[PDB]
Scaffold this motif. Structure first.
Motif, PDB file in Angstrom:
ATOM      1  N   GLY A   1       0.114 -14.781  20.407  1.00 32.10           N
ATOM      2  CA  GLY A   1      -0.224 -13.365  20.442  1.00 32.10           C
ATOM      3  C   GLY A   1      -1.620 -13.074  20.965  1.00 32.10           C
ATOM      4  O   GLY A   1      -2.226 -12.054  20.621  1.00 32.10           O
ATOM      5  N   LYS A   2      -2.140 -13.969  21.795  1.00 37.72           N
ATOM      6  CA  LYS A   2      -3.468 -13.787  22.357  1.00 37.72           C
ATOM      7  C   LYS A   2      -3.573 -12.456  23.112  1.00 37.72           C
ATOM      8  O   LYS A   2      -4.524 -11.695  22.930  1.00 37.72           O
ATOM      9  CB  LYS A   2      -3.809 -14.956  23.282  1.00 37.72           C
ATOM     10  CG  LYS A   2      -3.827 -16.314  22.581  1.00 37.72           C
ATOM     11  CD  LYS A   2      -4.294 -17.432  23.514  1.00 37.72           C
ATOM     12  CE  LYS A   2      -3.311 -17.659  24.657  1.00 37.72           C
ATOM     13  NZ  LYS A   2      -2.010 -18.193  24.200  1.00 37.72           N
ATOM     14  N   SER A   3      -2.584 -12.173  23.950  1.00 37.51           N
ATOM     15  CA  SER A   3      -2.602 -10.954  24.748  1.00 37.51           C
ATOM     16  C   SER A   3      -2.417  -9.701  23.907  1.00 37.51           C
ATOM     17  O   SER A   3      -3.100  -8.701  24.114  1.00 37.51           O
ATOM     18  CB  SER A   3      -1.527 -11.011  25.832  1.00 37.51           C
ATOM     19  OG  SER A   3      -1.897 -11.909  26.860  1.00 37.51           O
ATOM     20  N   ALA A   4      -1.484  -9.754  22.964  1.00 36.23           N
ATOM     21  CA  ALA A   4      -1.188  -8.607  22.119  1.00 36.23           C
ATOM     22  C   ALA A   4      -2.418  -8.170  21.323  1.00 36.23           C
ATOM     23  O   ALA A   4      -2.675  -6.981  21.170  1.00 36.23           O
ATOM     24  CB  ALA A   4      -0.020  -8.923  21.185  1.00 36.23           C
TER      25      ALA A   4
ATOM     26  N   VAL B   1       1.979  -4.554  22.578  1.00 36.26           N
ATOM     27  CA  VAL B   1       2.863  -5.032  23.632  1.00 36.26           C
ATOM     28  C   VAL B   1       4.010  -5.845  23.039  1.00 36.26           C
ATOM     29  O   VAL B   1       3.814  -6.951  22.529  1.00 36.26           O
ATOM     30  CB  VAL B   1       2.109  -5.883  24.677  1.00 36.26           C
ATOM     31  CG1 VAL B   1       1.338  -7.008  24.000  1.00 36.26           C
ATOM     32  CG2 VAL B   1       3.079  -6.440  25.708  1.00 36.26           C
ATOM     33  N   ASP B   2       5.210  -5.284  23.104  1.00 34.09           N
ATOM     34  CA  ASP B   2       6.391  -5.929  22.553  1.00 34.09           C
ATOM     35  C   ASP B   2       6.928  -7.014  23.488  1.00 34.09           C
ATOM     36  O   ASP B   2       7.550  -7.980  23.044  1.00 34.09           O
ATOM     37  CB  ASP B   2       7.460  -4.863  22.281  1.00 34.09           C
ATOM     38  CG  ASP B   2       8.805  -5.455  21.925  1.00 34.09           C
ATOM     39  OD1 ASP B   2       8.931  -6.016  20.815  1.00 34.09           O
ATOM     40  OD2 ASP B   2       9.740  -5.340  22.750  1.00 34.09           O
TER      41      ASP B   2
ATOM     42  N   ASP C   1       2.429 -10.085   9.888  1.00 35.96           N
ATOM     43  CA  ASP C   1       3.491  -9.145   9.547  1.00 35.96           C
ATOM     44  C   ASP C   1       4.858  -9.822   9.378  1.00 35.96           C
ATOM     45  O   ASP C   1       5.774  -9.228   8.815  1.00 35.96           O
ATOM     46  CB  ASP C   1       3.587  -8.056  10.619  1.00 35.96           C
ATOM     47  CG  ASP C   1       3.829  -8.626  12.016  1.00 35.96           C
ATOM     48  OD1 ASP C   1       2.852  -9.052  12.662  1.00 35.96           O
ATOM     49  OD2 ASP C   1       4.992  -8.646  12.472  1.00 35.96           O
TER      50      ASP C   1
ATOM     51  N   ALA D   1      -1.069  -7.981  15.546  1.00 36.62           N
ATOM     52  CA  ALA D   1      -1.281  -7.141  16.712  1.00 36.62           C
ATOM     53  C   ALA D   1      -0.238  -6.035  16.722  1.00 36.62           C
ATOM     54  O   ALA D   1      -0.363  -5.053  17.443  1.00 36.62           O
ATOM     55  CB  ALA D   1      -1.208  -7.969  17.989  1.00 36.62           C
TER      56      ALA D   1
HETATM   57  N1  LIG Z   1       5.576  -9.575  14.915  1.00 38.51           N
HETATM   58  C1  LIG Z   1       4.515  -9.831  15.712  1.00 38.51           C
HETATM   59  N2  LIG Z   1       4.757 -10.176  16.998  1.00 38.51           N
HETATM   60  C2  LIG Z   1       3.744 -10.441  17.850  1.00 38.51           C
HETATM   61  C3  LIG Z   1       2.367 -10.361  17.365  1.00 38.51           C
HETATM   62  N3  LIG Z   1       1.581 -10.682  18.414  1.00 38.51           N
HETATM   63  C4  LIG Z   1       2.381 -10.940  19.478  1.00 38.51           C
HETATM   64  N4  LIG Z   1       3.671 -10.795  19.134  1.00 38.51           N
HETATM   65  C5  LIG Z   1       4.841 -10.999  20.011  1.00 38.51           C
HETATM   66  O1  LIG Z   1       4.906 -12.378  20.396  1.00 38.51           O
HETATM   67  C6  LIG Z   1       5.205 -12.496  21.791  1.00 38.51           C
HETATM   68  C7  LIG Z   1       4.030 -13.137  22.516  1.00 38.51           C
HETATM   69  O2  LIG Z   1       2.923 -12.232  22.513  1.00 38.51           O
HETATM   70  P1  LIG Z   1       1.667 -12.466  23.486  1.00 38.51           P
HETATM   71  O3  LIG Z   1       0.557 -11.594  22.959  1.00 38.51           O
HETATM   72  O4  LIG Z   1       2.118 -12.327  24.920  1.00 38.51           O
HETATM   73  O5  LIG Z   1       1.338 -14.013  23.185  1.00 38.51           O
HETATM   74  P2  LIG Z   1       0.432 -14.947  24.128  1.00 38.51           P
HETATM   75  O6  LIG Z   1      -0.151 -16.036  23.258  1.00 38.51           O
HETATM   76  O7  LIG Z   1      -0.545 -14.033  24.801  1.00 38.51           O
HETATM   77  C8  LIG Z   1       1.566 -15.681  25.343  1.00 38.51           C
HETATM   78  P3  LIG Z   1       0.777 -16.820  26.508  1.00 38.51           P
HETATM   79  O8  LIG Z   1       0.267 -17.981  25.692  1.00 38.51           O
HETATM   80  O9  LIG Z   1       1.894 -17.175  27.449  1.00 38.51           O
HETATM   81  O10 LIG Z   1      -0.327 -16.073  27.191  1.00 38.51           O
HETATM   82  C9  LIG Z   1       5.418 -11.083  22.300  1.00 38.51           C
HETATM   83  O11 LIG Z   1       6.819 -10.813  22.261  1.00 38.51           O
HETATM   84  C10 LIG Z   1       4.694 -10.209  21.296  1.00 38.51           C
HETATM   85  O12 LIG Z   1       5.295  -8.919  21.172  1.00 38.51           O
HETATM   86  C11 LIG Z   1       2.182  -9.982  15.942  1.00 38.51           C
HETATM   87  O13 LIG Z   1       1.045  -9.889  15.438  1.00 38.51           O
HETATM   88  N5  LIG Z   1       3.272  -9.745  15.201  1.00 38.51           N
END
Ligand SMILES: Nc1nc2c(ncn2[C@@H]2O[C@H](COP(=O)(O)OP(=O)(O)CP(=O)(O)O)[C@@H](O)[C@H]2O)c(=O)[nH]1
Ligand SMILES: Cc1[nH]c2cc(Cl)cc(Cl)c2c1CCN
Ligand SMILES: [Mg+2]
Ligand SMILES: [Mg+2]
Length: 180
Positions: free
Chosen positions: A15-18, A29-30, A119, A146
């Motif tokens: 969830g780095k991006s979120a 961002v879902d 969550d 996030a």
């Molecule tokens: N339930 C929940 N889902 C989350 C949370 N943060 C991210 N997600 C979900 O997990 C997935 C990955 O999120 P993203 O933020 O892209 O992760 P990332 O680590 O940036 C992915 P990469 O490593 O490829 O860059 C997405 O579907 C996002 O909606 C959170 O705090 N809670």
């Protein structure tokens, strides 16, 4: 006034991006869109100081080591993200901290440990084991979501505060000078 270079690191999908986008754009961002590399700018006020945050959002997995080494050299502070339902991502934290310390040739590097997705009901990493890890490193630990935005501002602000303390230390640090 002051500029801080923050680097968000961690395994695939934690969830780095979120987190970053919640901080910057105030929305969740879902979608799961794998990151190559993304650069953000946020101006906030923290403890009565205007902070220009230069935030680097990194890939879960780098194909070239040299690309990882580059942000580990430049980053002043690191947000070390794992997902509470991803044991492997938690175990990866040790390896990120080690490589950063190698690259910096330093024992003191400002970091905040972040346990994201608090969550979810699918927890496999306990708060306590994460607290104990942070305590060992001497860094703050913060659980976030996030999706709900719990802990998001706090994670980033605390990181800024850690950088400040290290600059304070650095000045007076530690045997080869230093001031006050
Ligand atoms: N339930 C929940 N889902 C989350 C949370 N943060 C991210 N997600 C979900 O997990 C997935 C990955 O999120 P993203 O933020 O892209 O992760 P990332 O680590 O940036 C992915 P990469 O490593 O490829 O860059 C997405 O579907 C996002 O909606 C959170 O705090 N809670
Ligand atoms: C290219 C590069 N390297 C960085 C290192 C850190 Cl610590 C933070 C950032 Cl925002 C960047 C960027 C993006 C510059 N637009
Ligand atoms: Mg990403
Ligand atoms: Mg990574």
């Amino acid at each position: 006034s002051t500029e801080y270079k923050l680097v968000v690191v961690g395994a695939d999908g934690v969830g780095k991006s979120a987190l970053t986008i919640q901080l910057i754009q105030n929305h969740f961002v879902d979608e799961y869109d794998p990151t190559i590399e993304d650069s953000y700018r946020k101006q906030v006020v923290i403890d009565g100081e205007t902070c220009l945050l230069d935030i680097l959002d990194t890939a879960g997995q780098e194909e070239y080591s040299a690309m990882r080494d580059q942000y580990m050299r430049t980053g002043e502070g690191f947000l070390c993200v794992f997902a509470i339902n991803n044991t492997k991502s938690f175990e990866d934290i040790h390896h990120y901290r080690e490589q950063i310390k190698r690259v910096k040739d330093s024992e003191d590097v400002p970091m905040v440990l972040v346990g994201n997705k608090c969550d979810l009901p699918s927890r496999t990493v306990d708060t306590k084991q994460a607290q104990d890890l942070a305590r060992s490193y001497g860094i703050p630990f913060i659980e976030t979501s996030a999706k709900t935005r719990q802990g998001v501002d706090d994670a980033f602000y605390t990181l800024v505060r850690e950088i400040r303390k290290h600059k304070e230390k650095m000045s007076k640090d530690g045997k080869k000078k230093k001031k006050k």
